[PDB]
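User: As part of a screening pipeline, I want to sanity-check one entry by hand. Below is the sequence and the SMILES for potassium ion. Please return the complex as structure tokens so I can compare it with the automated output.
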Amino acid sequence: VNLLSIFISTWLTAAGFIHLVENSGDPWENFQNNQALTYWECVYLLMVTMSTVGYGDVYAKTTLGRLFMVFFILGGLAMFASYVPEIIELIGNRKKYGGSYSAVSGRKHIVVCGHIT
Amino acid sequence: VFALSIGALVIYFIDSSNPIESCQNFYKDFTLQIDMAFNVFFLLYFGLRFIAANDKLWFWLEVNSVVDFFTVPPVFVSVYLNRSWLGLRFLRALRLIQFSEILQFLNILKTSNSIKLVNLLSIFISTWLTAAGFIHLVENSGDPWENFQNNQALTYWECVYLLMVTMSTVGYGDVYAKTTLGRLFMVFFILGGLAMFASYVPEIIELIGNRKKYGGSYSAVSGRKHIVVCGHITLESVSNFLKDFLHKDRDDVNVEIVFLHNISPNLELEALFKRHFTQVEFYQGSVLNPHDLARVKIESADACLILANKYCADPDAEDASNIMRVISIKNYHPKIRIITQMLQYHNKAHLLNIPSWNWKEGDDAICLAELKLGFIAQSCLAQGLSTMLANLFSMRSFIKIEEDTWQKYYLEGVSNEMYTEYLSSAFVGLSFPTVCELCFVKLKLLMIAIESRILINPGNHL
Amino acid sequence: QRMWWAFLASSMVTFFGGLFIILLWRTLKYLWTVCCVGWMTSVKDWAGVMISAQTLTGRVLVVLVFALSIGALVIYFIDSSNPIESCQNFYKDFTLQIDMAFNVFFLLYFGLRFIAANDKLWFWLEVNSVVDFFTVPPVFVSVYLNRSWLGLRFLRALRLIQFSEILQFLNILKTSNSIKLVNLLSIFISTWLTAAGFIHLVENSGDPWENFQNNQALTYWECVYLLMVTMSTVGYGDVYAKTTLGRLFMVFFILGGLAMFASYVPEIIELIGNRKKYGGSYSAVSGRKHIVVCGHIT
Amino acid sequence: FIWTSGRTSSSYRKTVTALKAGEDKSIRLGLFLIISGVVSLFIFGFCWLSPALQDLQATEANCTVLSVQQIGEVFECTFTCGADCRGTSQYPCVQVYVNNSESNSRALLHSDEHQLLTNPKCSYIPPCKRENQKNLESVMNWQQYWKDEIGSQPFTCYFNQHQRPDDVLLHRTHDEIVLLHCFLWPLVTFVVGVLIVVLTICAKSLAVKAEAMK
Amino acid sequence: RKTVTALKAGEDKSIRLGLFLIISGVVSLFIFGFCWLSPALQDLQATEANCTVLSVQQIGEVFECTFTCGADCRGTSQYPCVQVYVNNSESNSRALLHSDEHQLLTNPKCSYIPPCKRENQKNLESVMNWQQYWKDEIGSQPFTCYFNQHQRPDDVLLHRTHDEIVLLHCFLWPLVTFVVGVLIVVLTICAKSLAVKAEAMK
Ligand SMILES: CC(C)CCC[C@@H](C)[C@H]1CC[C@H]2[C@@H]3CC=C4C[C@@H](O)CC[C@]4(C)[C@H]3CC[C@]12C
Ligand SMILES: CC(C)CCC[C@@H](C)[C@H]1CC[C@H]2[C@@H]3CC=C4C[C@@H](O)CC[C@]4(C)[C@H]3CC[C@]12C
Ligand SMILES: CC(C)CCC[C@@H](C)[C@H]1CC[C@H]2[C@@H]3CC=C4C[C@@H](O)CC[C@]4(C)[C@H]3CC[C@]12C
Ligand SMILES: [Ca+2]
Ligand SMILES: [K+]
Ligand SMILES: [K+]
Ligand SMILES: [K+]
Ligand SMILES: [K+]
Ligand SMILES: [Mg+2]
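Assistant: Here is the complex for your manual check:
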């Protein structure tokens, strides 16, 4: 639960910040180089960047957006590379040999234990 | 079942090249009749597995039951309607998950490594193909909120290539999903598919290529003798042995040396064997295995040499291991000459009770403690004699330097070894002192002894 | 008229005819039982000594092999800048004469390794035998035809695999770390260059179902750069394969080449740089005393 | 390395002699050639499927020209000059309309499927030879040679009412020879792979008989 | 307590499934809700009106349509531009008629586009045919029209571009998924608890 919460909150917060920064351009460029990016587009871009896939279809274009992208690439990739395997290990820890034997009428059964190899 | 799963997958691969929905005549479409028959067989196999099932509800929720519910009914509907939709037909690729199980049923897969390799390959390929089919469906049929107008004409193989590029994290960007559902699917697949790729591809590549480099067996050469060496084999042990065996001061012997050891040689031993490429062969095996003993052709070897670990922690354990090796070699071939090193003398006494151990035939147990204590005792009769004896065995060339030092004289003395050979009829009928003063500087040869057999420095009367 | 198939046919016919001749000789040797030290061993020993570096002539031959492998690779690198198929005069082409001589020397070195071989069929299936079947016959065909195709000539880069072995023969490589480093470097570079050449061939000659119309004009160095970008998983997308065969090759290379890169590049970088920081020795100063301290230092 | 970071710690009878190893390698090779040949057959089969059906679905017909005319409009061809040098030149557009054997109605002639796809608005394209004058001269030359072909000889033509619904071709764009080679050589690979396995097993089993004979 | 036999494992898998369908249905409802939000508000904000044509005319300029021919074959053909201006129920002022929002967005400079049928002559014939049918429609019958003073400030549409049926199905089937998920949990707990009563009865 801790890993999932930290991963999702970090992802969504970072996506919102890059959405704010991309939709409001650079002050030295007089806010003219803004990129019309939706919040879900920024979420998808962050996922692509974190996983290191880097399609290039969507990317930050403003100076502040790229400056934010550079600092996020240091932290977000270390988080993804660490958390996604650990979450996938934590899930799926199921016992294959559970349950119990179901007796059959008219047929005898034998229980064997001790040194099994 | 194994064949028809691949058949249905191939049928889906054929259909994936056509339009998304179409009208086609069942009575005139061989692929639709073949699919009809294949799905009849899968319905029958489903019915059999249902009857055989213990907990029905557990069976209904087994994923190859789910794969049949999502792939058999739509074939029936298509054959009834005389029309086809390329809908959830990519789920046919999930049939490859049972391949390892039905190979284990057929008594084909037994080893853990092979079972794991087949499982990993099946899971990887089925996941890849199924995910590619789903993204192909979603990309070719656009978003409902966009009124299906933003669809991207992507082929199934294009989607397969895109999935491979995405899984490996290369991300070229030449091909990518553009619809909202396609990207939403891409985001969820990036979490799972990269962890699968990063985990499975190294493990599969490790499972493959597990080949034994030193296999095979020695091939005997007519007219040339070979020697089998075993026991304590290491870089320094082999290096020291080869320096003495192949020394230029012996005559032109062409005895091949064959090593038998159960540890794969490290890079420096492999380089040492490459420096002796025409005279040394190595084969990986256990001396206790009659199969390995037959592999090294020990039944035709001139002798077997068993080196010992002189610096072992447990001399008793080392002696026991050498005794077991001797026992195994003699058991395989009683008539093999065995030369071995024995750390202790009581263990040597234990060994010489072997029924096949024949000291007359040439079985030599070189006892280290015995010979070293004997050499120390001969130094008590004449100091320096242990050095004198030890230098007569090691093969050494002449070394000369310009300095006038004790080392020059010492090295000149060290250059001589003890040899053994038959001597001329021109010396038969003379006394041993007489042939010694004759041989001494005319031939440049000194005699210590002759073949009442072994006589150390004979008198003038012989 | 085009002649690409003649070069390829000469390699295929050489590899498979030799394999079938060996298997037929084996079959017919045992079938003679139905109808019913030698000089051979002496020449096999002489060839095995020559193949190794146990004599001065053997060392000279090994050094010549080492030099001529790089020479043939450089010749291929020169040719990779030209058109895919062309007519060129053997009597007026210094690079074709040099290649002719180099392949004569490789044919002789192949003949020596064949004579020295213990199991012929094992030798015929050793990969540096395969590299000679796929690189020597097409040079002969080109010198006969007075024409060249830049076909499977990138397989010359696989000759770098034997560099560590022939350095060990020459008593140059002794330590395990150095041997491992040379092996890793040779395997990495040869794999990279060979794969780049194959993707260069496949991209410059389009898909047969598209009638060779979708070909992409990619230079060999462009393909080398693309392979490096793909192996490291950077994936810029500025350069990529566009043909179906090129992408099919890209998919199979992504499985193997990334596992090689991810494994070899860290291990090579660990093997290099293993230097002792505290080496050297103290330099005494005239007029000043010094004290040596040892034992329990913490 | 790039697989995660730090891998998240560490997340992971024998009477035959040496000849046995060469023969088992020969079995491997023969099996790999069998698999290669079958796999390449399926790969080429999926790649040829759409081109071969788009070709098969086009029927042979007998044709005759209804008219030859210019539409007055002009289009760009690209002309070439070494390394990468290209520029564009105009050509005038001809249209040609033709009698048809399946629809018995108007259709527009297109010399081949590449001409149809490079300019579906027009019936012919000159190979671009620098200046506009040479393109117009070459179109006028082709036009005059086509305009007098009135019922002279019902020339054969290729048509497909399902995907070229009012368009007609003078040529097949599918070379039978290239397809033949694409399916022949994978079959040869498979046959060679079988013969290598067969001769290897034949040699291996005769070696045992020749051993037992001694 | 563990008096139940093997049936326990199938019933716990049935609880899992029913819960997963409940979560799926709720999650898909939110996902579809965020995707439909902007289209549904852009549609809701457009009011129904009564209209009448002020004039029908050509601007003399021409534009490209794309015409298609199998696999990927396309080329371009010209069409002449009509403009049509219309009486309006919210602004009571000039606005330009656009047959639907896709026509407005594919060519906002022009009032109609012909389906591209090869040659320029057939495009011009089809525009002249539509033009003549619209030019004589003077107060004949105040045809209903769709308008939005906030985002189509001087542009008018003849149709809704938002299919109510497609939206209905996008919210209905996730609800069905949720209801089915609840019934699976309920029947599984009903069966599980009745098995204990039928056991204690013996
Ligand atoms: C195929 C679909 C449509 C219907 C399935 C058949 C239904 C009605 C019936 C037929 C056979 C039945 C099963 C027969 C045997 C057992 C074992 C018993 O200890 C618990 C009930 C259980 C597990 C039954 C559950 C219900 C069951 C599966
Ligand atoms: C002795 C063995 C290894 C030779 C290898 C087979 C090669 C050399 C054979 C196989 C097919 C042959 C070619 C078949 C056809 C032609 C076309 C002709 O206009 C010149 C001869 C030429 C070019 C032949 C050259 C030799 C050739 C390429
Ligand atoms: C060079 C190619 C084209 C032809 C190959 C020559 C073949 C047919 C002949 C020449 C010499 C023969 C070899 C001579 C000696 C041996 C050693 C024996 O223990 C196994 C058979 C083997 C290995 C023979 C196999 C067949 C053989 C290799
Ligand atoms: Ca001496
Ligand atoms: K990347
Ligand atoms: K990338
Ligand atoms: K990219
Ligand atoms: K990456
Ligand atoms: Mg030998």
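Points to compare against the pipeline: Chain B touches chain E at residues 54-58, 60-61, 143-145, 147, 149, 180, 184 (CB under 8 Å). The first helix of chain B runs from residue 2 to 15.
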